């Protein structure tokens, strides 16, 4: 579940990478190569609404 952002970010490409950024704001690890959360892509929805 927990992986390092960027490698993971690339993985989804249009999900986890994005997820990490917003989430950092949310309450998860941030993007730009470092720490990320997979399947956290929900960031788009949660953060938005």
Swiss-Prot record:
Induction info: Part of the metY operon that extends to pnp.
PTM remark: A proteolyzed form, called IF2 gamma (begins with residue 290), can be detected during purification which has all the activities expected for this protein, although it is slightly less efficient than full-length protein. It is not clear if it exists in vivo.
Record localization: Cytoplasm
The organism's place on the tree of life at top rank: Bacteria
Phenotype upon loss of function: Essential, it cannot be deleted. The C-terminal region (residues 165-890) is sufficient for growth at 42 degrees Celsius, although it grows more slowly at 37 degrees and is cold-sensitive at 30 degrees Celsius.
Family (UniProt): Belongs to the TRAFAC class translation factor GTPase superfamily. Classic translation factor GTPase family. IF-2 subfamily.
Function per UniProt: One of the essential components for the initiation of protein synthesis. May protect N-formylmethionyl-tRNA(fMet) from spontaneous hydrolysis. Promotes N-formylmethionyl-tRNA(fMet) binding to the 30S pre-initiation complex (PIC). Also involved in the hydrolysis of GTP during the formation of the 70S ribosomal complex. Upon addition of the 50S ribosomal subunit, IF-1, IF-2 and IF-3 are released leaving the mature 70S translation initiation complex.
Miscellaneous section: When overexpressed partially suppresses the slow growth and decreased 70S ribosome phenotype of an rsgA knockout; RsgA may be involved in 30S ribosomal subunit biogenesis. Silent mutations of codon 158, which no longer function as alternative start codons, decrease beta isoform expression to 31 to 50%, the strongest mutation is GUG to GUC.
Quaternary structure note: Component of the 30S ribosomal translation pre-initiation complex which assembles on the 30S ribosome in the order IF-2 and IF-3, IF-1 and N-formylmethionyl-tRNA(fMet); mRNA recruitment can occur at any time during PIC assembly.
Protein name (record): Translation initiation factor IF-2
Species annotation: Escherichia coli (strain K12)
């Amino acid at each position: 579940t927990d992986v390092t952002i960027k490698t993971l970010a690339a993985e989804r490409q249009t999900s986890v990478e994005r997820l990490v950024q917003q989430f950092a704001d949310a309450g998860i690890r941030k993007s730009a190569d470092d720490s990320v959360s997979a399947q956290e892509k929900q960031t788009l929805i949660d953060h938005l609404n």
